[PDB]
Symmetry: D4
Amino acid sequence: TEIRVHQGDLPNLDNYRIDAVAVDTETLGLQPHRDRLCVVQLSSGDGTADVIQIAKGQKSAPNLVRLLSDRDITKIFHFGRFDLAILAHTFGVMPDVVFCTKIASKLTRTYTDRHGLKEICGELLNVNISKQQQSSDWAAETLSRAQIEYAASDVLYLHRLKDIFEERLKREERESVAKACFQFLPMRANLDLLGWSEIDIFAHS
Amino acid sequence: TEIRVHQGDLPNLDNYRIDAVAVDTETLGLQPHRDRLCVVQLSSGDGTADVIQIAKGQKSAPNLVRLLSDRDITKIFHFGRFDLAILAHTFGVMPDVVFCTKIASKLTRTYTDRHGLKEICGELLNVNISKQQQSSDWAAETLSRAQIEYAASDVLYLHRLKDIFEERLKREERESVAKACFQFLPMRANLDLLGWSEIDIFAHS
Amino acid sequence: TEIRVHQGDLPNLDNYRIDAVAVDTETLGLQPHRDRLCVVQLSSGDGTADVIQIAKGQKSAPNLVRLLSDRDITKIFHFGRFDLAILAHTFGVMPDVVFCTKIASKLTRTYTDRHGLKEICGELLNVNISKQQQSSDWAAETLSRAQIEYAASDVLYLHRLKDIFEERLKREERESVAKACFQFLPMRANLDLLGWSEIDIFAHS
Amino acid sequence: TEIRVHQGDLPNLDNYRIDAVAVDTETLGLQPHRDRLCVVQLSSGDGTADVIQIAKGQKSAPNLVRLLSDRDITKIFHFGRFDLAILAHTFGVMPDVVFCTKIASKLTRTYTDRHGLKEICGELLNVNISKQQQSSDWAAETLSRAQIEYAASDVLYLHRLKDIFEERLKREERESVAKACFQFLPMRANLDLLGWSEIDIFAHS
Amino acid sequence: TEIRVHQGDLPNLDNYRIDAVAVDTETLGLQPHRDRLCVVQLSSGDGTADVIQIAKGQKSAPNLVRLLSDRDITKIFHFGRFDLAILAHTFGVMPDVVFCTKIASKLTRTYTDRHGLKEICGELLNVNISKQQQSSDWAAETLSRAQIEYAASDVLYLHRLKDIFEERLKREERESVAKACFQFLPMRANLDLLGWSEIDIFAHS
Amino acid sequence: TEIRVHQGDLPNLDNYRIDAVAVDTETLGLQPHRDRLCVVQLSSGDGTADVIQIAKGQKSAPNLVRLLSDRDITKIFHFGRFDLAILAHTFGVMPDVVFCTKIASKLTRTYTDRHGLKEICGELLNVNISKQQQSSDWAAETLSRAQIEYAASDVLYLHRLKDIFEERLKREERESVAKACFQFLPMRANLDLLGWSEIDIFAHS
Amino acid sequence: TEIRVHQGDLPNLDNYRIDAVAVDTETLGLQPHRDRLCVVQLSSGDGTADVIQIAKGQKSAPNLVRLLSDRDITKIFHFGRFDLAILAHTFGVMPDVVFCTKIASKLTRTYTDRHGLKEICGELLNVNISKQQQSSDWAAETLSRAQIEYAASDVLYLHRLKDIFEERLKREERESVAKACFQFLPMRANLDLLGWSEIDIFAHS
Amino acid sequence: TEIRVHQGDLPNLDNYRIDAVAVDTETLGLQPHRDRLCVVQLSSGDGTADVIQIAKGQKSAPNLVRLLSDRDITKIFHFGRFDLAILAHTFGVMPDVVFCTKIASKLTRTYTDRHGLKEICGELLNVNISKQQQSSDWAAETLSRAQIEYAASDVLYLHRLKDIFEERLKREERESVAKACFQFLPMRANLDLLGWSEIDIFAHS
């Protein structure tokens, strides 16, 4: 649908006077200390998305960061463990009110071992997400139309998933488990930034 | 060392008007749904210990449970993930103010991969704990003297370790990380009881 | 295909005055202590099937359990190790006269290592079994038509397989081996319920 | 200890008018079709043992086979899965009333993963069995004194172990599980002889 | 594409007055002691094949066995290690003049790791072998036409492959290497029959 | 395209008075001591290629070796570790001014784990390389048209890739890292020839 | 032995007007971004050593760094890949004239797979290195005598090993191999610092 | 005992007019193309041995190679697969009358998985071989006395082992199996030299 592309930051928050915002990122790789943040995508759940290109060496994005810091607004991620880490490493603010659809999937879709976003969207919404058959240079000065549409597709459905997962968590009486997991998730991301990314800190060995 | 052996429960809490209590358990195995709790050992950090034999089918232990429920008293474990699970499964109360020396070791003793209690005690206190060369039936009606001495030896040093680990956590500026881990540890134990004991809930796969 | 869908139980056993009944289950997952029984499917071997949706917390299903307890009726399963476990956990009655097509396949189809129901039906009957709905929300209040047809397809062919496998077991002179395996299968399922689900009880290690 | 050595068979059954006999074997290796049975040792549970040297190509041992066939005498083995296989392969008779200390250990000593005979004897009886520091040619025409004493040491304690394991099976309410396992054990051995020795017939894969 | 189907044995050797014969087998599985020989296939190198059904318990096939033991006729196999084993086990005669296309492939097609018959036929002859969609009951009294054609397809091309592989062995100067491997192959099969099927007899460990 | 096929050597260097030449090889396999060099392909980057057939036992190729030795011409490879080894082993000259697109990919395409030439050409240039549908000999006296066109396709695009990778290396400020890696790559190939091909010489173990 | 312990830096370079200096480090762990440098050890090759305690957050050590940047002085390490990384990370200077005894061992001691310092010293010098029986806190304000003597023992023998290894490299004609490996080693360490510490940059996969 | 040390070759064969000679080698490592032959040991089976130091680059040893070529003299090895390879690589002559105690052990000592020379000598002869406490430089100009004695100990007992293994091979009726294995063993070594050292040429994959 409508995808608004920005350089550096949102112009304002007129579209984000809401109770929950869907958030995703794109980077040059899986290691936040080496691989810089290149794109941030946002959606209010109204079927539109904002795509913000982040410049190399950029240290601040005040409007976006105010949104990320607002404790009255839940940030919805799929596998937020990574996005939280890269966002905190880049802008210096660790979000602390979050919902993760992957943790929710692992707590509710107990009849499968496939917890990726594509499988969740397919099963829960009968929506077919098409995943790029190649990767791309997210640090490119000009993003392609295909890149923009792929980047937007990762945030367009997270509100609907959160609603369904919240009903299922209520149904199976696991709400407090999920709440505690989401409360701990930002510290799991911090542990990743500090150097324990390969360690399950709670395991016996 | 003075070891007081009790049947079922502590007679009173006269010996436990303190800020922190060391706690450990002994079971018939690693699976709380199959392997029953057999012994609970406690120490005030003094030179004496209390060893409480738990009967088959015992569902209540009012004095012990008061300690486990008292939010004003920190419960010290080594690998509390297991002990919390078996205690909650046995008595129906999940402690929520805990300190775990194994998590603290993983957060401070970054120069080694051996985090067992014997090795920790050896490095931090130059105390040699001798571990039994065989296992035994902890459900026996009468415990042997060797069993009682081993059970007491498992709690006598956790206070000194906690003091040292708190010094190290302050030194390396990891106090808030440890605090968040300890806050989440009871829910990790509940996740174990509910059926996710073999799953790292935060891993990508 | 005629599929009769019921809530809670069969109305009567008028359609099941027979020597063998095909049985299958659906659940929320592979772990009976966490994942509740959601659907039970039955077939008389005719062109119709019964699909009984089981409610959350349901403890009783007298007509179904009566059928399961009738020692004059052989219960046919594919991989009955699981179905027997979940049935016994849910209703408290362990069937003791059973036939399992997966054990029979391993005892007769020695020229292949693929013993799943789809492959067996393909080889033995030239019948094409489809999929995709296997991983779906079986706890939904209203099952979809696709879910109902997929659930029924799992019982429609077990009688024909039992007939062919009995012929093959006779041909290779392995009938008494199979009979002994079927006699032990309920105890293998009980061992699973008691906590040895990950243990080969007969292995050296 | 008194060890009576015989060639071929017992002279008579005067010492074996008893309710249970301990049985063990020695062979040229683990594969009954290649590696012949070389020695059979028996004990009445007293302080003496019988060691019977079996000749190459020997097809019959009437007194021994009388014991193996007698349904009024329980045959005690440690890991009878192997001994039953080699005995049935050699003499054509499969015992069908058996007790196995390894299954009993796996059903009762749930607090350890070490189920060897040495560990069981050490824990349950505080008896130290010394195992040969070298292997040897059990097919030798004349066994050494060290060989004979080692071979006998494998049967002198099985009665005492069976008595203790019977107490634990009663205490933990697993008597019927053990009984069903013992009934299936001869068929597990037959499955081994027929060619499924590397296959857990009850596993999903 | 003449395929002559026989019961028990060839009627005579009029079509096999030749210097080399292509040979293949079908069985109930990979373990000769458990899985009986069901079919023997022969080819003169022409466009026709002979498919011989072997009965359960059959001990003799004088014309076939005469062919197998005639040292002036080279027997061509693909992976003859197996066929030689099952033939020797069934009829009591081990061929000693053989050619194996798998050894030849491993000695000449060093630029690939895929040495199956389909890949060899595709690369060297541009012949497309179509493999069944599953395995089948080769012990059936009447083989289907599709089964017969597949069985014939396995021998129709071995002469042409032998000719090409001989050219390749001459080109890379490995004729004596291949000859020594072929000389040892019957004894490798004997080791398999005797019980070393899982052992590389030449490996250090 | 125009592909010039030669026997033994280039006729002259009239087409190669240039700053960089794309180089690839084909062999009988991955082991230079066993598997001889069969074809060398070259391109100046003008959309044409030279395909040079190397004879068995050929020790010299004077015009080609002049190109390989000339320090003013950068030799571009994909996974030059192999090509450098086989070229030096065959003609006795190790190139020392090289660029490798695989090392460059590992230093720049950090967002993917697929670094093969097909994936790089597909992703970076939107060019579809169609690879062999089987293997080939390459030792054939006369190469097929399909072989020649496939062989040429491996050098036609390396100049464009080198240009892009050099731009990306500049963007992420990794030029000196790549330069040091390329300086060491010939010595890595030499280490392979001397016998350390299976050893990461820099690993702790 | 004489061991001089310093705080922060060497007092002067009066003892290091030499051609080669032995260098080793101790840290809080294997990950330079998390685990700080705690101790630096130096030796002139005589019977004395210098042990320099490095403070938390220390950015400068001018005399030490003069040694590190003196192109006329070879720095001898055992497994310098790590020490170079941690030194460059801490003080911002990468030594570029180095010798590593582990690379030399892998290039000369080809008859063994054990390349640790204890085994090398044992074989080459008949010197017994005693390894600490526990791990310790190298960040302690005051190191114990056992710690100081252990830390010194790691540098006292590197000169003698370098002499012997140089003889071995000349004898086996691998001098140029070693020189190229040593020249690349600082860049391998830089690659570790940049984020490729887990990647063999030269491997095919 | 008496150990005669020579450089290059035996002075004559006066002590080796015998029907079987024990042979062993020492090298700089496991890869014959990289790691040169350093020592050859010989024994007549009496209480003395000859130890011959081989110089770097030495291409001929006429008396030794005369011994190796003599078809009337059986060469006894332990794991001759390696020694045959290195001998053929060094002197160009492949022995073709051999006996290997390791193959014999694998064909007779079926009751164990431990086939090393030390274990064999311990079991079969009650002879204690003491193995070096480290590795050493076998290319040293002067071998130490301890080195010479260790090297000699590997040949002093092979005759007695051959006699015992031949008795056992007769007893289990595996003489023709062993004979065929020994005939192929030189060709297994040739395959190693040609480049198939890591390939079981007879395996399915």
